[PDB]
């Protein structure tokens, strides 16, 4: 159970919490703004999934400040996670290449 594998699991676990909180917070921030689309929990959930994967569909995006701040937190958490997996993967391959040359 090496650091990079511990950290990736921690990042993935953390991301799911950021997603769930992110869905919940979006709805609480958006409701009140006229025309806001992120006003239901299941909708905001899949919005979060899209946003965490840096994907935007049409005008399915927050309009409020805090809603957009949530979006920022979701995005950053998303990229950090899928950047940490790559880093963890890279560490695994470089470790084996060190074993490959007997180094």
């Amino acid at each position, epitope marked *: 159970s090496a650091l990079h594998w511990r950290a990736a699991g921690a990042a993935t676990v953390l991301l799911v919490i950021v997603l769930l909180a992110g869905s919940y917070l979006a709805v609480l921030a958006e409701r009140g703004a006229p025309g*806001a689309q992120l006003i239901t929990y299941p909708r905001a959930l899949w919005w979060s999934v899209a946003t965490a994967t840096t994907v935007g569909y049409g005008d399915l995006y927050p309009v409020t400040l805090w809603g957009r701040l949530v979006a920022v937190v979701v995005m950053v958490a998303g990229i950090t996670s899928f950047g940490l997996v790559t880093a963890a993967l890279a560490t695994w391959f470089v470790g084996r290449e060190q074993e490959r040359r007997g180094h």
Partner: antibody
Amino acid sequence: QVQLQQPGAELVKPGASVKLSCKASGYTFTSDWIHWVKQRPGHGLEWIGEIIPSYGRANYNEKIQKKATLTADKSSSTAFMQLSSLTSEDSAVYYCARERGDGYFAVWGAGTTVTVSS
Amino acid sequence: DILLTQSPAILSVSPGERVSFSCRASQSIGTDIHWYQQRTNGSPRLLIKYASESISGIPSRFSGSGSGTDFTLSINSVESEDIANYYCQQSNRWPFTFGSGTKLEIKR
């Protein structure tokens, strides 16, 4: 079982204020939203507001005048609607409804028949 | 604010026939719409959630149709207990809005 409970009727003098109550049993999540709907005699349904009891943030219909102000007591699971400066146009049945935060209002209240007269 | 339009206002039908209430939104709302039944003196009762999905306890005679702007609530074999006002309610954008309503009448 009956989920939401409202007083049957409320009498108010013209210009005076009134607080309306709405307690709830059964499943009461943190994510729950309590709305309030206005129905005049022989008229359609009219959304007035919504409030999440666990945080106390309320939203109001800005199309009509903001006469109401929403508050909620956490321990009693009861939502309140503070209406002030009432005219004859405020004489209506007022419903409270439980919304799981997914659009539809699943369970409704009995309704409070408010009459504005001297 | 989404404007919902229920045409016609009053709807008369023969007993045992099929009926259809239409509700049109001001703009595309997908399937984010809900139907409510309200009889005399009674409080609103949920019939069909999300355009077509049925609620348990609700008769199998009730079924929902439509997407986009055109939406329809339909009853097969209309009976006495169905005489009521019918309301469509959207949940696509804030704030939530209701239709004007459609009253069902049975010609016996």
